[PDB]
């Protein structure tokens, strides 16, 4: 029902989530709230550098490529702990601590 199939459903959910009136709870604030998911998204976005796709289609030779990928894969937990602690109540503190 999102057209023929859900080919538009995905970006539809994206656009819906776009507005959704970000709430920013009281305990904890922009000091760490907006800072949380930024580290998460960058930790995996920057990894796209050394990933190749075909014959001479690499973005950077980067002889330390897979090493850089392994190093950037172990930065997300920082952002997860930050986000899960950006609030105060439970179900987010331990909910992020576990992961």
């Amino acid at each position: 029902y999102a057209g023929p199939l859900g080919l538009l459903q995905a970006i539809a959910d994206g656009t819906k989530l776009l507005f959704k009136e970000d709430i920013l709870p009281s305990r904890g604030d922009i000091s760490l709230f907006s800072i949380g998911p930024s580290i998460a998204v960058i930790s995996v976005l920057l990894s796209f550098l050394v990933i190749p796709l075909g014959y001479h289609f690499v973005l950077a030779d980067l002889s330390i490529g897979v090493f850089l990928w392994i190093a950037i894969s172990s930065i997300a937990p920082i952002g997860l702990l930050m986000a899960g602690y950006s609030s105060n109540n439970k179900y987010s503190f331990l909910g992020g601590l576990r992961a």
Partner: protein, 194 residues
């Protein structure tokens, strides 16, 4: 000789907007209605068939109805099952703690009036709209497992009936009053120990 007349429309409601600035919010609300997510809640005599809405008899998940078990995330909640006096003082917290594009509806004839709990009992609440403002009232105890999808289709048009200037009718004010008390405090009764 009318009783309780309706207030006058204060604005003249005379304006005109550009298409390049209107179709944006038009398709935005189209996505907002075509990507709604349920919020899990269900108690009593008008709930159980909601589960069947996830299987091979009824499948409302075919439309992207992602069931979220959290208030702050989702926007569509079904007050399924007859509500009583209690479990309400924490129910309204859900409606208070989600983003503004909620547009909540009802479900269960025992939630629009309290049908089979309406002779004499100090528990059941007479309807839900005396607790939370919702849009559509759904009959049936149990509610017809197809009527809920039809009412979802009905409500699917109200969001499409919104414009760019309509994104200001969710802003609030504060009638915060300065009045104190003089009484005695009561210690916590729900002591959690065995």
């Amino acid at each position: 000789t009318v009783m309780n007349l309706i207030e006058f429309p204060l604005l003249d409601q005379t304006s005109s907007n550009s298409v390049i600035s209107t179709t944006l919010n038009d398709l935005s609300n189209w996505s907002r209605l075509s990507s709604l997510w349920p919020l899990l809640y269900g108690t009593s005599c008008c709930f159980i068939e909601f589960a069947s809405l996830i299987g091979s008899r009824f499948d409302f998940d075919r439309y992207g109805l992602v069931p979220r078990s959290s208030p702050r995330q989702a926007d569509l909640i079904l007050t399924a099952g007859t509500v009583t006096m209690k479990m309400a003082p924490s129910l309204v917290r859900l409606y208070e703690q989600m983003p503004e594009p909620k547009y909540v509806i009802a479900m269960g004839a025992c939630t629009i009036t309290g049908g089979m709990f309406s002779t004499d009992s100090y528990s059941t609440v007479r309807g839900v709209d005396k607790l939370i403002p919702v849009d559509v009232y759904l009959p049936g105890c149990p509610p017809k497992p197809e009527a809920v999808i039809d009412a979802l289709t009905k409500l699917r048009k109200k969001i499409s009936r919104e414009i760019v200037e309509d994104r200001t009718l969710s802003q609030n004010k504060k009638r915060c009053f300065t009045t104190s008390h003089k009484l005695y405090v009561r210690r916590s009764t729900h002591t959690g120990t065995y």
